[PDB]
C-alpha cells in the first residue's frame, strides 16, 4: 500500500482517515501507528480530544473534590 | 518573538562529500564512523527541534474552542482567535506573522541536503496555540493546572487584578475603559507589526543563520582545498584511481572536515534554540497558563495574562 | 485531611508502579549515559581506522616501513586520530553545555520545588504545586511534584458583585456563586460555600457602574446582636 506524505513516500502504511494521537512521528502532522488482521496505519496527528468550555458571561465551574497527584520529573 | 525550531536539515556524507563515485565512497568507509555519526547527530537535532515544538505548544491534551458568540464583557479578542473565513486557521497577527517572516532551500536540498519537515506542521501548532488561546479566556489560569474551569473573562481578568494587588473593584467600575485599552493595545501590536518588520528578527536571523550555514555547506564543494579541482568525475576522468586517490583524499578530508564544521555550528545552534525553545515553553506554562509574578518576565509590567501566537519556527507572546 | 493522606500515600505508590511498569521513565538519563558510550565507543572505533594511511595499528606501519618513509603514514593517522579526537571532545562540550543547562533546572527546581513551594505555573509538575521530594537517580536526580489538582467542577451563576444597599460588594477572597437560588461566597479553587457577610465582603461605591451585579442580602454579623438587644 502506497501513500503519499509530505514527508516522503511511505509504502506498507495504509493511510485511514481518522485521527489518533502520535504514536511514530513521520512528519509533516503524519504520525503511523500499529492498530487495526492488525497493520500499520498512517493518520494525520490528533491533536487532543475536542471540547469547548461551556463558557458564558455568568456562569464558572468550581471544583468541589481534588485529587493529590504526584507527577514524576 | 521567541525562536522555538529550526530548520530539521539532514546531511548524507555518501552524496554531498561525492555522489556516483564508488571510489571515493570506499574511501569514505575506509575514514569509519564519521559520517554515520553526524546523521546520527543531525538526527538528534532534528528529533530535538520536533521536541521542542511538541513542548512550547503541546501544553495541553485538550483543543479547546471559543463559544460560537464571542462577548467577554467588552475584550475584543478576533484579532488574536483564528479567522473562521481564511483558509488557514490562523489569526490576522499569526497571519501578519507569518507574511512578515521569508524555493531557495530546495537549493541545497538538491545538494545531498534533505531538509526534514516538522512534525507538528504550521496549521496544527496554530491549533495548539488556537487552543491555548480558548483555554485561557474560556477557562483563564486553570486549564493549566486541571480540568478546564469556565469563568467569565472579565470576571478572570478581575482576578488576575487582584493577583498584581489591585483590588477587583477597579477593573468592574473601568471594565469598559480596561476593554477599550485592551483592544486599543491589541490593533497597535498589528500596526507595529505591519510597520516595523525587522520585529521578528529574532526570527528571520535564525532562518538567515540556516540558510548561511547551508549556503556555505554548499559552496564548499566548489572548492578544490589544495586538490587539482573541485569536481571528482574530473580528477577520476583525467589521473589513475593510484594516482587520483591522493587528490580525491585531499577532497574527502577537506569536505569531510567542512561538514564537521557545519554541524558543529548546527550543535551550537541547536543548543542555542534549545536554550530559546525552554524559555518559551516556560513562558507558555507561566505567562499564558497562569500570571506570573516575575518581574519583566511576562512583559515590562505587572503581568495580567497572556497569548501565544505561532510564528514560523518561533512563537509569538502577547504580554 | 485523611482523604489526603489516603491520597498522597497512593499516588506515591503509582509513581513506585509506573517507573517498575515503565523502566522508560528514565529515558532522560538512559539517554545520557547511551550518548556518552557511544561516544565513547565512536572514538575507540576510530583507531581501527586507517584514515588513508596503510593500516590502522602503528607497530604495523613501524615494523614494516622505514622510519623517514612512514613518517608519513604515522603522520596521517596522528591527523585522523586527532581529528577524531578533537571530535569527540568538541561533542562532550556540546554535551557538558547540555547537561550543564539541565543541571542547572535541577538545581532551580530543587531551590524552588523542594525547598519551598513555587508559583511558576507547570514548573513542580501539572498542577498546583503542593511540594516536592527529590530522588538520587544515576547521574541524575527524579523529583516526585506532589501537585493539587482540582477534580469534580460544578457549574454555578456567578457575579461580579452584590448590590445590597444600593452599594456593590466584592468578595473580599473567591467568588460570589449560586447554587440557583441562594447566594454564597466561596474560595476559588475549592467549593466551599459561605453565606455573603460584610466580613466576606469589601464594597466599592455606589452599584450601577459594575456589570452583571445583582441584587442580593449582604448579611450583616452584628445585625443579630441588634435583635437580641
Ligand atoms: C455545565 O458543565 C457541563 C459539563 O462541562 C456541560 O456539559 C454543560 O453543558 C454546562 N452547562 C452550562 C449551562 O454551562
Ligand atoms: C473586533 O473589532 C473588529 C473591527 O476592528 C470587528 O470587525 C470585530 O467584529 C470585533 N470583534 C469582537 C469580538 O468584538
Ligand atoms: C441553595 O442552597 C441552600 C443551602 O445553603 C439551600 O437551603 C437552598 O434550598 C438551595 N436552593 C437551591 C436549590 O438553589
Ligand atoms: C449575561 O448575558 C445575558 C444575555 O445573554 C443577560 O441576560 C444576563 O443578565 C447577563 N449577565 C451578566 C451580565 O453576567
Ligand atoms: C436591582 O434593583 C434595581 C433598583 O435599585 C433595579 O433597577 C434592578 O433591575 C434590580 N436588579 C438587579 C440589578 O439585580
Same mark, same amino acid.
Given at each position: ?73 | ?319 | ?21 515503565? $523502566?522508560? /521513565? ?11 558510550? #557511544?561516544? =565513547?565507543? +565512536?572514538? %575507540?572505533? !576510530? ?20 622510519? $623517514?618513509? /612512514? ?11 586527532? #581529528?577524531? =579526537?578533537? +571530535?569527540? %571532545?568538541? !561533542? ?37 504545586? =503542593? ?99
Amino acid at each position: 500500500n502506497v501513500f503519499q506524505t509530505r514527508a516522503g513516500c511511505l509504502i506498507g502504511a495504509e493511510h485511514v482517515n481518522n485521527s489518533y494521537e502520535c504514536d511514530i512521528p513521520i512528519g509533516a502532522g503524519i504520525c503511523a501507528s500499529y492498530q487495526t488482521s492488525q497493520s500499520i496505519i498512517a493518520y494525520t496527528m490528533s491533536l487532543g480530544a475536542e471540547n469547548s468550555v461551556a463558557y458564558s458571561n455568568n456562569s464558572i465551574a468550581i471544583p468541589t473534590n481534588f485529587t493529590i497527584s504526584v507527577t514524576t520529573e | 518573538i521567541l525562536p522555538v525550531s529550526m530548520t530539521k536539515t539532514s546531511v548524507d556524507c555518501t552524496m554531498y562529500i561525492c555522489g556516483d563515485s564508488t571510489e571515493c565512497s570506499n574511501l569514505l568507509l575506509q575514514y569509519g564512523s564519521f559520517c554515520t555519526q553526524l546523521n546520527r547527530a543531525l538526527t538528534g537535532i532534528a528529533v530535538e527541534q520536533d521536541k521542542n515544538t511538541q513542548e512550547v505548544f503541546a501544553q495541553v491534551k485538550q483543543i479547546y474552542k471559543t463559544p460560537p458568540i464571542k462577548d467577554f464583557g467588552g475584550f475584543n479578542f478576533s484579532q488574536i482567535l483564528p479567522d473562521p473565513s481564511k483558509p488557514s486557521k490562523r489569526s490576522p497577527i499569526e497571519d501578519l506573522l507569518f507574511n512578515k517572516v521569508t524555493d531557495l532551500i530546495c537549493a541545497q536540498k538538491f545538494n545531498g541536503l534533505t531538509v526534514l519537515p516538522p512534525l507538528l506542521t504550521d496549521e496544527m501548532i496554530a491549533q495548539y496555540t488556537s487552543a491555548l488561546l480558548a483555554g485561557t479566556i474560556t477557562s483563564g489560569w486553570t486549564f493549566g493546572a486541571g480540568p478546564a474551569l469556565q469563568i467569565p473573562f472579565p470576571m478572570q481578568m478581575a482576578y488576575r487584578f487582584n493577583g498584581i494587588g489591585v483590588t477587583q473593584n477597579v477593573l468592574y467600575e473601568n471594565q469598559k475603559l480596561i476593554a477599550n485599552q485592551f483592544n486599543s493595545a491589541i490593533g497597535k501590536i498589528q500596526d507595529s507589526l505591519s510597520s516595523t518588520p525587522s520585529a521578528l528578527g529574532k526570527l528571520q536571523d535564525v532562518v538567515n543563520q540556516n540558510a548561511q550555514a547551508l549556503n556555505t555547506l554548499v559552496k564548499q564543494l566548489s572548492s578544490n582545498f589544495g586538490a587539482i579541482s573541485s569536481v571528482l568525475n574530473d580528477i577520476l576522468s583525467r589521473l589513475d584511481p593510484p594516482e587520483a586517490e591522493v587528490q580525491i583524499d585531499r577532497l574527502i578530508t577537506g569536505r569531510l572536515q567542512s561538514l564537521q564544521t557545519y554541524v558543529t555550528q548546527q550543535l551550537i545552534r541547536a543548543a542555542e534554540i534549545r536554550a530559546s525553545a525552554n524559555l518559551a515553553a516556560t513562558k507558555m506554562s507561566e505567562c499564558v497558563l497562569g500570571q506570573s509574578k516575575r518581574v519583566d518576565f511576562c512583559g515590562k509590567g505587572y503581568h495580567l495574562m497572556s497569548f501565544p501566537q505561532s510564528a514560523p519556527h518561533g512563537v509569538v507572546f502577547l504580554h | 485531611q485523611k482523604l489526603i493522606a489516603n491520597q498522597f500515600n497512593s499516588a506515591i505508590g503509582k509513581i513506585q508502579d509506573s517507573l517498575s511498569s515503565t $523502566p522508560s /521513565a528514565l529515558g532522560k538519563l538512559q539517554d545520557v549515559v547511551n550518548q556518552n558510550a #557511544q561516544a =565513547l565507543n +565512536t572514538l %575507540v572505533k !576510530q583507531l581501527s581506522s586507517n584514515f588513508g594511511a596503510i593500516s590502522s595499528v602503528l607497530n604495523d606501519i613501524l615494523s614494516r616501513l622505514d622510519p $623517514p618513509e /612512514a613518517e608519513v603514514q604515522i603522520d596521517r593517522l596522528i591527523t585522523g586520530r586527532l #581529528q577524531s =579526537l578533537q +571530535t569527540y %571532545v568538541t !561533542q562532550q562540550l556540546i554535551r557538558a553545555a547540555e547537561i550543564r543547562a539541565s543541571a542547572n533546572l535541577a538545581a532551580t527546581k530543587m531551590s524552588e520545588c523542594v525547598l519551598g513551594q513555587s508559583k511558576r505555573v507547570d514548573f513542580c509538575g501539572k498542577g498546583y504545586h =503542593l511540594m516536592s521530594f527529590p530522588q538520587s537517580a544515576p547521574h541524575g536526580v527524579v523529583f516526585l511534584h506532589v501537585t493539587y489538582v482540582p477534580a469534580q467542577e460544578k457549574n454555578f451563576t456567578t457575579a461580579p458583585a452584590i448590590c445590597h444597599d444600593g452599594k456593590a460588594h466584592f468578595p473580599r477572597e473567591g467568588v460570589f456563586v449560586s447554587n440557583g437560588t441562594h447566594w454564597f461566597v466561596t474560595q476559588r479553587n475549592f467549593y466551599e460555600p459561605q453565606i455573603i457577610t460584610t466580613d466576606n465582603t469589601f464594597v466599592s461605591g455606589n452599584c450601577d457602574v459594575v456589570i452583571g451585579i445583582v441584587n442580593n442580602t449582604v448579611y450583616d454579623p452584628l445585625q443579630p446582636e441588634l435583635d437580641s438587644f
